[PDB]
Design a protein around this nucleic acid. Structure first.
Lengths: 122, 180, 200, 32, 131
RNA sequence: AUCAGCUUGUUGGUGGGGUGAUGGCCUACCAAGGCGACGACGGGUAGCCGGCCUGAGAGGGUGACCGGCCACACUGGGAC
RNA sequence: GUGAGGGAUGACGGCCUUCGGGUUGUAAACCUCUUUCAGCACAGACGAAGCGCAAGUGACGGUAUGUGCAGAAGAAGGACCGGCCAACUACGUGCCAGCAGCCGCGGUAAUACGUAGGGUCCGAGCGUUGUCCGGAAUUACUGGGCGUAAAGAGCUCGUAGGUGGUUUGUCGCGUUGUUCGUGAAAACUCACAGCUUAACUGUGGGCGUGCGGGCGAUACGGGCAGACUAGAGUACUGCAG
RNA sequence: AGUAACUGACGCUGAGGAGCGAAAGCGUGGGGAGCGAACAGGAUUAGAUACCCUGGUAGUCCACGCCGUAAACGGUGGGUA
RNA sequence: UCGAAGGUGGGAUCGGCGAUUGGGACGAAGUCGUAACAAGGUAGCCGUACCGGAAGGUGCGGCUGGAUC
């Protein structure tokens, strides 16, 4: 535009959408697992993804994905959720950390253990 | 003993009633590293013939790059097709700072110190054409002074003349040392 | 820390002898492992990757220190490559290996880090210690009876030390006049591509 | 241009006008 | 209406150049005459003169080409235009084509070249770039 | 501005009062002024800076350590 | 810092195999070496041209640091290996279990899932999440656009505002030059110096991109006072709808 | 357009604002031939809330006011060289 | 006289819940039709009005971003 049009109005930058709004500026956030269930992915994929409806201390109800081979999560479980988006399930934007609070590390795991909360067997 | 650079190999397809007809296209740059560049585009049925045709057609188009010692004369801006590329001279020891296609063209040109930036249409072929246009847009102090009808000291700045003078001083020293 | 695994393994993987006198490397000039003999795609990034890796491993420098040396060289008014080579050459373990007192660079580090040297009369045991112009290095008098030390001094017939270095007398007193120059350095490997690797 | 764009716009406008017609008396009752 | 006689001068010169014309006729101005003199002194135009027209004076600029018809001036542009005006100090003078061009600058001493202003240590308004 | 009108010790003057000192800081009287589409009057948010991070630069984010200024001391008011 | 030298056309064992053989690999076992730091002993600070008119005065501290004692003796893990991007084979599962930043891999040959050998990048760290900047010329002052990709108001008149043809004199507001004051210290940069190097610290310049005071210039922009007719409007005579 | 006697820069654009603005539609009062949303039949069709056929009210028309929209398009703002 | 806290009164403003109710997005497999794209079998679309289970139909004015002449 004209330099006078720029003087009168100026440049207003675009707005930056908030990412992971339920964490409220925190890396991790604790919650109680209100429900555990399984759901089916989109068109070209086929599995039983393990998800959990949890209630964070932000007083926000969210869905989190449970990674690994297996888990022992039921209702009323202290879980620690963190960021992370899996493309396969459109609704989920959070993942439950394996190896903290009531969430156990996967069993018989011996590669990339840290990301799955497994101790180094001696 | 030339410098050959293959920057893009692309499989193009035509549709016929039977099915698809496949061909390969290659963009190749040939240079001697002393200030000679050539850009060739070769179409064939398979990659090696395409590369060979591109090399041969590149060798039919060479151009002179007006560089003083190790860098271009002055900043330039080049528009070609829909690509825009900016070139700026640097100081010795800087290195070549350019994106893929521009990096290939400038490495083949023999320039060692340059600031290059691509300002749209990141397609390799159009970027290469823009780089070539920017290089062709360059000017050299001798014909500038001739065009204005003035002694070269009245046209060029002091620093450029000094850098040129030490450039041919080093060139004469190198010629003497390589003679024996 | 510092590297602990076998040196011949990485020397054979790089395909270039690092010590120089190795016998198990030249007979296997191919990388190790199951698929070391397989042909690999030719990419420049990989090329200067082994260039930097062998440059920083022929000495013993870890990644962080070598990076720091790179930024130290870049800010200097001279050219980046020559500055980096000079800075790498200025270390004590490099000097003692280049002065003929050590047969192995790792041995040179293990010797200079054991407090067997004194620079300018003050005890120093820093493998990364950098020497300067007009500098004098001596060996503590108690260590002259050390068996490997006398083994090293009796065999003073190896490849002669560069011009700037001087082992002048029977006391093995090291004098350094001025920092080595590029042609004075006489060390293999390409150097501008390391600048390219770290200048992306 | 392409008539798919005008087609999308016209369908949205048509649905909204139909909805407005369907809830005339209720809207007048609430607004008053 | 006419808002920028200087830019009109520059663009008439440019358009006449790109079509390979030899004479350009213009309304006369003192600043236009000064610009034309600075252009002639730097070997960008063959000559320039003034004539009496039917109302006011007129300025005629004779362009210069090479032996094989090479245009002497490669580019003309206006920097400080009505609206946004540009002023430069004595220690931030611009460089055209890395120094191979000429930047006309109006200072309190008169109308000078960027090198003339740098040598005399003054500053002013950057009227145009010619190269 | 999906907040266009706001102000009556409010704008000026005079005689007094008060203060360390100028002053509607206060009081009695007189004049009807003063601010605003260069955003008055409303709503939201926030301690400010030298600096710090990023960036070729312009710019963007920020005010942790260290240093300077301000404000506060369970909440509100007051004075010795 | 968890060791250094030499050591076979290069022991096993694991894993592949085209059943020949190859990788781990000089790696291991082996004979010498030195002890860094910790370990056990002995001595033991500077900080104090201090304080005190009484003979004393260090919290750190018996600490840093030196001189000895036998011995390699006490010291390594974390990610990744479709392509972007350094690095492959076997086995088990078969659209299940599962992976994933993008495109996307799994339905009996998976270098992509999981486990083994191998390899690559780092190493007292390695990965993950969150936040900000960059790449993004993707709010474009530097540095973008509006026929058909998003983008010219349905069309005019006009208020505030923005901009303005040729020329004469003056002011010195914008502009520009010089000089002076200020711009705390620390921070940044350059140089030097100090602690065995480093991180760290000190010293001396620069930076502190602005503001104000005095003095100079008057081309351009602007104000004030004039002039001109080429823009604009009017006047006279004809024209078409 | 011609003459150029006259004024002597009085020009350009224009945020908000105001005016004008096809057709359909609304209010009051007229008018009503033809055409014709809606509404009736007939036909086609698996069904035809349509296309085709026969009728046909509002409207189209006039006076005075409202609304203020169109593929209101050259999908192209105005002034100047 | 001024004066914090408190009492009474009518408004202003910003939010949560709410029986019932409207539209929007996405879903391995469902029912009804055929509206647009070739003159898509009645050219399509724009503003407006009426009508119909639904896409949709028709009247008035406009556009070519409509095929053949």
């Amino acid at each position: 535009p004209t330099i006078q049009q720029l003087v009168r109005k100026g440049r207003r930058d675009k707005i930056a959408k908030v990412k992971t709004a339920a964490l409220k500026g925190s890396p991790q956030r604790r919650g109680v697992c209100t429900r555990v269930y399984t759901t089916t992915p989109k068109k070209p994929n086929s599995a039983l993804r393990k998800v959990a409806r949890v209630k964070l201390t932000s007083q926000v109800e969210v869905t989190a994905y449970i990674p690994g081979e297996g888990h022992n999560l039921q209702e009323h479980s202290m879980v620690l959720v963190r960021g992370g988006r899996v493309k396969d399930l459109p609704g989920v934007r959070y993942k439950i950390i394996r190896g903290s609070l009531d969430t156990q590390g996967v069993k018989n795991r011996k590669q990339a253990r840290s990301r799955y909360g497994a101790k180094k067997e001696k | 003993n030339y410098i050959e650079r293959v920057v893009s190999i692309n499989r193009v397809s035509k549709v016929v009633k039977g099915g698809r007809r496949f061909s390969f296209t290659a963009l190749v740059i040939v240079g001697d590293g002393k200030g000679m560049v050539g850009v060739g585009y070769g179409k064939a049925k398979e990659v090696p013939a395409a590369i060979a045709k591109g090399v041969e057609e590149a060798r039919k188009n060479f151009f002179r790059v007006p560089l003083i010692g190790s860098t271009i004369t002055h900043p330039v801006q080049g528009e070609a097709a829909a690509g825009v590329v900016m070139l700026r001279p640097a100081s010795p020891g800087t290195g070549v700072i350019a994106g893929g296609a521009a990096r290939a063209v400038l490495e083949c040109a023999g320039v060692h110190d340059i600031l290059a930036k691509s300002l749209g249409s990141d397609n390799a072929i159009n970027v290469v054409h823009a780089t070539v246009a920017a290089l062709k847009l360059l000017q050299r102090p001798e014909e500038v002074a001739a065009r204005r009808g003035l002694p070269i000291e009245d046209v060029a700045p002091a620093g450029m003349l000094k850098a040129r003078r030490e450039s041919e001083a080093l060139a004469a020293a190198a010629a003497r040392e390589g003679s024996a | 820390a510092r590297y602990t695994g076998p040196a011949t393994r990485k020397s054979r993987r790089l395909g270039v002898d690092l010590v120089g006198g190795d016998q198990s490397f030249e007979k296997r000039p191919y990388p190790p492992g199951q698929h070391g003999r397989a042909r690999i795609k030719e990419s420049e990034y990989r090329q200067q990757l082994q260039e930097k890796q062998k440059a920083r491993f022929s000495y013993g420098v870890m990644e962080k220190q070598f990076r720091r040396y790179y930024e130290e060289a870049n800010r200097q008014p001279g050219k980046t490559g020559d500055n980096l080579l000079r800075i790498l050459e200025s270390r004590l373990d490099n000097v003692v290996y280049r002065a003929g007192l050590a047969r192995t660079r790792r041995m040179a580090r293990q010797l200079v880090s054991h407090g067997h040297f004194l620079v300018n009369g003050v005890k120093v045991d820093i493998p990364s210690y950098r020497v300067s112009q007009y500098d004098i290095i001596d060996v503590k008098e108690k260590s002259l009876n050390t068996l490997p030390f006398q083994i090293a001094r009796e065999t003073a017939g190896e490849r002669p030390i560069p011009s700037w270095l001087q082992v002048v007398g029977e006391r093995q007193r090291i004098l350094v006049h001025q920092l080595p120059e590029r042609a004075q350095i006489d060390v293999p490997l390409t150097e501008q591509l390391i600048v390219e690797l770290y200048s992306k | 241009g392409s008539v798919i764009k005008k087609r999308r716009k016209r369908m949205s406008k048509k649905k909204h006008r139909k909805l407005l017609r369907r809830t005339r008396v209720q809207r007048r009752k609430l607004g008053k | 209406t006419m808002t920028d006689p200087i830019a009109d001068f520059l663009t008439r010169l440019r358009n006449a150049n790109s079509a390979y014309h030899d004479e350009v006729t213009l309304p006369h101005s003192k600043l236009k005459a000064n610009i034309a003199e600075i252009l002639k002194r730097e070997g960008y135009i063959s000559d320039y003169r003034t004539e009496d027209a039917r109302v006011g004076k007129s300025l005629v600029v004779q362009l210069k080409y090479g032996p094989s018809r090479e245009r002497s001036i490669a580019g003309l542009r206006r920097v400080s235009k009505p609206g946004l005006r540009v002023y430069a100090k004595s220690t931030n003078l611009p460089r055209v084509l890395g120094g191979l061009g000429v930047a006309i600058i109006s200072t309190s001493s008169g109308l000078l070249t960027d090198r003339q202003a740098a040598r005399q240590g003054v500053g002013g308004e950057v009227l145009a770039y010619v190269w």
